[PDB]
Amino acid sequence: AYSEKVIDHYENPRNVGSFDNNDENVGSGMVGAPACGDVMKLQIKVNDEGIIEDARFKTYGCGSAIASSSLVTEWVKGKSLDEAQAIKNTDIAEELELPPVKIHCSILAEDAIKAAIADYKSKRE
Amino acid sequence: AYSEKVIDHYENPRNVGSFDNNDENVGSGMVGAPACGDVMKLQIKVNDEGIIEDARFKTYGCGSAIASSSLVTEWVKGKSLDEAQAIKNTDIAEELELPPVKIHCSILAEDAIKAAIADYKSKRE
Amino acid sequence: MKLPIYLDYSATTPVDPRVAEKMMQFMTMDGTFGNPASRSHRFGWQAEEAVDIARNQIADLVGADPREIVFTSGATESDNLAIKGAANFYQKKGKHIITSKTEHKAVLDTCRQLEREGFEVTYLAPQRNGIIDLKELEAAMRDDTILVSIMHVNNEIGVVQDIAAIGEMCRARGIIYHVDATQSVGKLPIDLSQLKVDLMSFSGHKIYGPKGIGALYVRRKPRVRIEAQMHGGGHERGMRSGTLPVHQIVGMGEAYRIAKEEMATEMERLRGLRNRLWNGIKDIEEVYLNGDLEHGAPNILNVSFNYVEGESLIMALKDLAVSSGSALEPSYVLRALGLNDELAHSSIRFSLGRFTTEEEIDYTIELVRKSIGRLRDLSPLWEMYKQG
Amino acid sequence: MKLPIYLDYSATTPVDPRVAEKMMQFMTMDGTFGNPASRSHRFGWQAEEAVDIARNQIADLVGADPREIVFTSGATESDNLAIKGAANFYQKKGKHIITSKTEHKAVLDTCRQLEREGFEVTYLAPQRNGIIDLKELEAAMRDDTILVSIMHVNNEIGVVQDIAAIGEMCRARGIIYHVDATQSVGKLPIDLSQLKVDLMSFSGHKIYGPKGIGALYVRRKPRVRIEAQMHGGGHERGMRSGTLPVHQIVGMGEAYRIAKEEMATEMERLRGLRNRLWNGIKDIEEVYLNGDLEHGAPNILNVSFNYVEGESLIMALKDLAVSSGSALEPSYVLRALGLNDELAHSSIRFSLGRFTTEEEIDYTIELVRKSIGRLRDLSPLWEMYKQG
Ligand SMILES: *Cc1c(COP(=O)(O)O)cnc(C)c1O
Ligand SMILES: *Cc1c(COP(=O)(O)O)cnc(C)c1O
């Protein structure tokens, strides 16, 4: 019942891995949402003075949940702090063509990126 | 579920017909036994001074009931008043190999012959 | 030719070859043998798709929404589900049920059980022609009447009740109305989008499908609700649990798709034979037609011959495969019509079908004339009748 | 080879060719298509004889008297009939019923319905290995306990309950004992002349027979009595009304005759594969066997993998046709065992069968190793576990 893009991202996830949580260049946010009991850790490292250099993720959930956070890391690369700040789950769901049921994967994906950003801003200090 | 002899007698009943009820030579007895709602009319004409000349029947019931009274008319021919008097249903059932259910056809057959005899004896007078 | 001549299509019908060869493709390891319930792989999906096709094939034949189609094991289960499910659901509104004395056992025996469960059943007597008097049905209706079950075509005499008119009466008083349409599906036309019928039962093996498979129409609008009688997973929208017999369902769906096509011409052909048959025996001195030649099923003809015993008749018709008013009990149908036990006993139910031919109808016509006159020659009752 | 690999025999099994070709001879107009109920002609008789043969074929496989064999539409109906019929019959003695939390839905959902009918059901929790503790079963028994239902082989994890020992306990206290033996028939040996089992349910499509047909063993001595749930003519000795699906019944009878022969060798072959399979994956860091390798069905293997999400696992195993602990609800079986929702979610039920090969078992072994290590690379939980 999955979409083609989701299959692609699930079977070939882009940006798997993790960054040093004390990298100073890195803001990491790990958000889960027990309600289906998933959890995805996303984190960025920013090109000092705004723009985003690179991001990485790890996740635990459906292929949808996975493809969701995969897509996000891909989208975030080359973006700004704020450009990525205004991503909105809805856009993530449209792209992946998510069914009503797996809508929670977007909300979560958005939560993750927003949480990582907030972490970066908090550390400076 | 019928026996071969029964089929024979049912499909080729021996002695169908009726006698004159005032033949003076004839004793007729028509017995039915509501309980299954059948009815068979048997009647004889006797060779004055004992022996039986000829008999005839009509019946309404199973092929068993029919074959039963058929057999009886056949057996009674050439018999005596008393020889035929001691026929007994059981013998009729054995011959035709009647199942427990169609046992009532014997009892009835016997009833019929015995009733016809009694009728003859009654008229003389 | 070919003896004995099969005239018992009302008992069961031979699976049409097209129906069968379609079933074969949903059994073996190389076919589509999967379980529709398995919602996690190709096998379950392919089976699932075939199920839907059949569910629709069945729905299209009766003018219903495929979702309103609930699968059962047969018309018996359908009848049970229908009357039991609704009675237990709408019991708070009332506990009174109305039905015809001539209903198939699957219905009557269900009501006998319900009676011993606390419900109150009114078994209506039909007219001498089998037709139910609607005035009487109406008189029987009370504020606490919750369910009425009257069958379309009768399985013993083939009389046709005006289910349409009854549907109106029921809907009008807000009474659930069930119809045992097992003998009429694929024979008489049915459109549930016109009909005010709330619940309808069909099987397959009466219309050349496989035995052990049936359906139950449960109206979606206005929504009719029933309590499931078969629990274990809440399948069929929680009305009938249990694995869906794919090959059996395909069989049904296919037999219904065929029915939709050939029903028109075929049913008028049978009508010609049935007429032919009655033509050839109606002249016999004391023969009685049970039902309504005019308003009766084209494939069923049930007649009673007077002055000959039931079993002796059946035996005489060795060459035919028919059914009779015998069982330690005569046909309750024929006795609810107002026939005495003897006339009821000596009844033959000729049921025509796909393979019936004029040739055979003629053979039967003569065979019946032969037998009756012969058995009447042995009958002492016939004599008394013949003379005073 | 041939993808996807069918490892879902527990959901359903492909009708053995011999089973099918025998069924074909009881469908079309030239075959034996008659109705057994038609007790008045050749057609009904020939069908009737075939029915008996099958009824005996089934009886011989389980060591029962063919008269004790009641035909149903499947194991679901059997389970319903068994537990409902007896409960309503012996209700005056008591209204308490005992059963296992891990029972198939057909049983549990039946007891839920009965509870709302006034009965009292005690759902027993099994040990972490799925085995029921007999001491606990005994403690649960009261003077008013009338029925106990414990299944032979479990359909999710394949654990085997000592039905023999339980039978003794029940008989001893005069409690009716029912066994859902659907997963064990034709696999594990059954002899009702030794066993103290009062009621047993079997279906056909779990052992390579057609779907939509089953049976219910009702003990003759000492006589066990049940109230029919399907009314309409009092067929099957008045326990199950409705036309007997001949071609379906023949199918069953034939699949049981085959089972009796090939069951011995086949079951030990499956045991070798199942072992092989577990061998190839038991070394994976955090995998969990659900059931009892020693005392468990030879054809079922259910394992839980930690730190990977259920659905992502299923997706990874696209190449296999298996089943899982998913449905908005994890497997209640695996949660009654004492597994948390996550571990329960991420469970795979491998079920082997007739067509399974060592070749495929090897492919699966590697496929599972591949997938788990890969999904764990994406897992952030795996990392936290990996380091403190
Ligand atoms: C034969 C018949 C039934 C029985 O249904 P099966 O599908 O044979 O169980 C029910 N109602 C009528 C009117 C029938 O003729
Ligand atoms: C599949 C299964 C059932 C259902 O029986 P059907 O014949 O498929 O309706 C019941 N009990 C168990 C243990 C099963 O595995």
Residue numbers in the entry:
A (entry chain A), B (entry chain A): 2 to 126
C (entry chain B), D (entry chain B): 1 to 327, 333 to 393
Task: Quote the study's own text.
As established previously, the IscS-IscU complex is also a heterotetramer. IscU binds near the C-terminus of IscS, forming a very elongated S-shaped heterotetrameric protein complex 150 Å long and 65 Å wide. The IscU is in its apo form, with no evidence of a bound Fe-S cluster. IscU is a two-layered α/β sandwich with a core three-stranded β-sheet and bundle of five α-helices. IscU makes contacts with helix α8IscS (Glu309-Ala316), helical turn α10IscS (Glu347), the end of helix α11IscS, and the C-terminal helix α12IscS (Arg379-Lys391). The bound IscU projects its most conserved surface containing three conserved cysteines toward the IscS loop that carries Cys328. The distance between the modeled Cys328IscS and any cysteine of IscU in our structure is greater than ∼12 Å, implying that a conformational change must accompany sulfur transfer. Each IscU molecule interacts with only one subunit of the IscS dimer and, based on its orientation in the complex, would be expected to accept sulfur from the same subunit to which it is bound. Since most regions of IscS show no differences in the various crystal structures, either alone or complexed with acceptor proteins, and in view of the high flexibility/disorder of the Cys328 loop, we postulate that it is this loop that bends closer toward IscU in order to effect sulfur transfer.
